C-alpha cells in the first residue's frame, strides 16, 4: 500500500498514512514507512502529503481517495 504523488510540486515535505498510523519526513525520520524522493510505501486508510507549489507560496496538504 503506497501513496504516490504526482503533479506540479516545487517541494514535497512530510508524507503519512491516516486512518496517524505512520509519518515519514523527507530526511527519513519516521513516527515502517519508506519514502523515495516521489512515493512512500508503508478500516480504510488515506494517503496524506504536505507540499509547496513555489518558493514564495504557502504550505499545503493533499489527501487521497
Amino acid at each position: 500500500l503506497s501513496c504516490a504523488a504526482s503533479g506540479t510540486i516545487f517541494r514535497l515535505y512530510d508524507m503519512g498514512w491516516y486512518r496517524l498510523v505512520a509519518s515519514i519526513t523527507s530526511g527519513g525520520s519516521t513516527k515502517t514507512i519508506s519514502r523515495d524522493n516521489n512515493t512512500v510505501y508503508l478500516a480504510v486508510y488515506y494517503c496524506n502529503a504536505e507540499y509547496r507549489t513555489g518558493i514564495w507560496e504557502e504550505l499545503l496538504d493533499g489527501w487521497g481517495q
Binding site: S26, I55, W56, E57, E58, L59
Partner: protein
Amino acid sequence: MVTAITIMALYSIVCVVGLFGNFLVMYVIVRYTKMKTATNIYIFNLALADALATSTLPFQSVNYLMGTWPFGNILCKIVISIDYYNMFTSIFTLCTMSVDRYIAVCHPVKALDFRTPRNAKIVNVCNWILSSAIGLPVMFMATTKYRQGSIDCTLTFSTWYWENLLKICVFIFAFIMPVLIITVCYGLMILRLKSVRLLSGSREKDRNLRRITRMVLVVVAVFIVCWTPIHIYVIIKALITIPETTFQTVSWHFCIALGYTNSCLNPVLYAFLDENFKRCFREFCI
C-alpha cells in the same frame, strides 16, 4: 523646442502622480496602528525621499523650456543637493531593508530582539546623517553662473582631480558596494528558503514572511533597472569624448528621465503586492 515641450509634459505627469502616491503611502502608515512594522518604517523613508525628488521637476522643466534658470541661487543649491540626496538615501534604505529581511529569515531567535521599530527609526536617522557627508559639499559648491547667453545652474569645482573624484565616489559608494551587500543577503536567504519546511512554526507566519520578502525583492530590482543606464553613461562619457550629435542629446535626456520616473512607480507596487496597503488605499478613497 520639441524636446523641451516633451520633457515638460512627461515631467508634469510624473510630478502629479508621484506626489499624490507618496503622500498617500505616508498618510496610511501614520493613520493606521496595524501598519507600523520595521519594514513599514523603511518603506516610509523611501517614499519621503521620492516626494522630495518629485517636487523639484517643474523648475527643471521650466528651465529646459525657457533656456534660462530664473529661480535664483538658493533654489539652485537646494535642487542640486536634493538630486544627490535622492540617490544616496534611496540606495542605503534599500540596503538596510535587505539586511532586516535577512535577520528575520535566518536568525529568528535573535531577530526578535533587533527588529523592534525604534531600531528602524534610529537606522533611518543614521542613514540621513551618513548621506549628508556627500550631500552638503555638493550644496556648498553649486552656483548660478551668468553665461552671456543665459543663466546656468551648475557645480563649481576647484578640475580633473576634483570632478572625476566626485563621479568615481558616486559610482563606488552609492552603487557597487550596496549592490554586492544586497546580492549576498539574497543569496543566503534563498539558500535558507529552499530547504526549510517551516520558517516560523506557524503556517500563517511562514506565508507572511515569504510574501514580504518577495515584495522587497521586486522593489530592489525595479530600482536597479531604472538607475543603471545613467550610471554607465556618466562613466562612458567621462573617458571617450563622444561627438556631439542629436542621438547624444536625446539619449542623455531619456536616461535621466527614466531615473526620475522610478520615483512614482513604487506606490503602485505597494498596492498590488500588499493586502494591507491595498485595503487602506481603498478605504481612503471610499
